[PDB]
Amino acid sequence: MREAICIHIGQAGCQVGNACWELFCLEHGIQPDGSMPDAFNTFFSETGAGKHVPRCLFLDLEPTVVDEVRTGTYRQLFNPEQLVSGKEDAANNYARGHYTIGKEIVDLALDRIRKLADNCTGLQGFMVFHAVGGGTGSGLGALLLERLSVDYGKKSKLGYTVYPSPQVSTAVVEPYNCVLSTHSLLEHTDVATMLDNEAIYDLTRRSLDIERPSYTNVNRLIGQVVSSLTASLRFDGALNVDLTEFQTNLVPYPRIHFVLTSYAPVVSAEKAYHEQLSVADITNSVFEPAGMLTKCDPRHGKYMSCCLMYRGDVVPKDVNAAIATIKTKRTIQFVDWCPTGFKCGINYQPPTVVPGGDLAKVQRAVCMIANSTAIAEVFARIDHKFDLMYSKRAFVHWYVGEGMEEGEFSEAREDLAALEKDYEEVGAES
Amino acid sequence: REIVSCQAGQCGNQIGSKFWEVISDEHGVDPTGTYQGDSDLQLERINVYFDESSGGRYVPRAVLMDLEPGTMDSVRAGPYGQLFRPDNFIFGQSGAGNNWAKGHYTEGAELIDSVLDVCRKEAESCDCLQGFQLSHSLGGGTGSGMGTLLISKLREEYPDRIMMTFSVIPSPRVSDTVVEPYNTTLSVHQLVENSDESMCIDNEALYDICFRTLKLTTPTFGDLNHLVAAVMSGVTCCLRFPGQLNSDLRKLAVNLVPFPRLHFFMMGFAPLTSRGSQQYRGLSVAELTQQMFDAKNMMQAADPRHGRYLTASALFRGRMSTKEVDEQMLNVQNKNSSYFIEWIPNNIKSSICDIPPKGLKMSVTFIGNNTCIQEMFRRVGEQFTGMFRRKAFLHWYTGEGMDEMEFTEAESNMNDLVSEYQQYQDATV
Amino acid sequence: IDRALLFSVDPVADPAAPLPLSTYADTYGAFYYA
């Protein structure tokens, strides 16, 4: 029941899922060996020995990260199978991860996914984790999403994608990979969630107050947000919202499924007991552009739909008061044809803190998943980078000699242009 | 009801030896021979495979045969080798040389008189004999020729008795003899015309399991013999132990083949698992059933997808509920109607035994005859005919007493068997 | 290698575990045994 199969694709998804499963085990009381000294059913399967194993598939084209997992303290938790590692990576090449290396591993990945799905009688959703900046998570991610949507059908899909930021980017061909994979995400992704790195970095610098934050902290924040999102189906609450429950509210149109994510209170132990932890204050911090996990200013845009999911000792009252204050204040403006425009999902299980982490124990938390017309900004940035790099034809022979035609890039550029035009059209007033 | 074992050739001797340690330890017998089991169920049918001594020692109901004394040396040096009775040890001085002619006509016949004397005394000691079983390899003339010679006159004077036989048909991938197709062709026709059943072991698929399903570092012939021994124990588990729905060798034979010609089977055991899955994957009937019908668990390397399951039977072991054991084999009925033959309704026989194999809480042995059991006979016939185009390696046989046309008769029997298999493969209602 | 290790999920707990009683004894008179 409430089943969510986790898929991590490549290095980025693998580390993110490692943090996510860390959080899941800590908040479900599962020891690293895999036993507790039925809320776990949606993420852990219980075998005859009394041990629980995660319902996740790590899928990488390079073995370093999966070998780190297989040598880590969580050897006895993760299944030796459903841990697929290729032998040569995509090396920041969507074509190489989608056409040659990905083709010889997608069949085995599909077999593993089918094995996972056969074990669950209440399959509700797939939680994909990837970064389209790289090659593996872009190409193999596109192939996996295509095959999963072809086979399973209308099963809910939530792709948490780490898009390349406007300025802080670790590779040059990331615009190509992102533009090429945007078409695949658009066609076979029910809900896509931004996970840009600059926003998380700035959030940790200013709010977590970490001088030198890292990928571990970023993945900890992502695990926190996924736990807040899935807690509604995991535990009891006043407003239990399932995957489809909040999916039917972020997608006015099939082409409109890219959303921004935000979490609060993202604070350390020191400030946890200096600030006032009221639901209204946390919601205000959430709606504040600074308190958001996507480097995308919402003021330049205008919201289409919102989902606030509250975790902990929250009550519907001050949730209502926060909603009323949000309506009253004109700093953040909403679309005219959504009077309601709010999902409210309340859950009674307060967040847990990973020992040795940076987030503090807090009685209440808010996670906002918002579909907004401001999302066009990051697409404009990425396709402007794509156009600049495409003007005089760089990093193109790598894709051409790998099995991709030169016209695929142009088709992807037209798809991005159409998506931007559709965003502008739906954001236009009457 | 009891079974008299026979071990022909080096391969048969080692496989049967492993079978004997597994049976003895399952029944609670130490290699010294005394009983130390803590359950009455081990004792209550220890008489199926073990004879009482005056001092109370349990001696195996087995006979050993070879033309090389080295195999007897190895068997006795084995961990449980001194369990066997000494007069059962029957060995020759000169090996067959992988020559079916030497194994069957000249060298084997000189010792088969003593072999039959031992078997006849053994059966007369048996109170109400349920059958014989033989373990042998068709590749070498020592086990193929002498084993078929033993069968030929065991069935002559035990005609109404079950003749269980595990034939190890070697494969071109693990081929290590050039007279291999000769011996296989010259043994298969006795095996088919003169046995109620004759069921297959393939060294290629054993290695395939040890590589892909079971994933060991150094699985030598010992591990292969261990799997074959475990499935041998499973095929008579129901006879030796109680269960919800019991069966015996005759009881499975009478409903596993539809016609007396077609009595060749392919193997199966569940659960086969490595250290990456034994502690992780839950032991359940669903896992057992899903692992019973894939080639990667099948320990004979003829792909069942190109064939049609003419009939199959499943001997479950362990305390388990009685619906799923055949509900999940009704699922296969419904989902693989193409794999299952049409004119046999409910192609699946099921038996349940209360006692699982030692060290497991749930197990099952899969034994079935399909139409893909035709492929290895086709390929053996190809190789046999290919050398027969110019009488390759034929003088070693024809100068030992064999006539040229006996090879023609064997080839004709191969053609009849493969034609029979294909015509009931494509037979329609 | 060792058969118990090859076939048993627990290499030491499985082969030392006692054999299960027959379903007849486990069901038909277990309450009389009490």
Partner: peptide, 30 residues
């Protein structure tokens, strides 16, 4: 495919370490 000694993480290595661990368990039991 050249075989490497234990401690190198290419090929069957996880199963190899698990096999050595359960061997040690069986031996200590005896």
């Amino acid at each position: 495919v050249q075989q490497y000694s234990p401690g190198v993480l290419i090929g069957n290595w996880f199963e190899d370490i698990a096999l050595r661990e359960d061997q040690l368990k069986l031996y200590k039991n005896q």
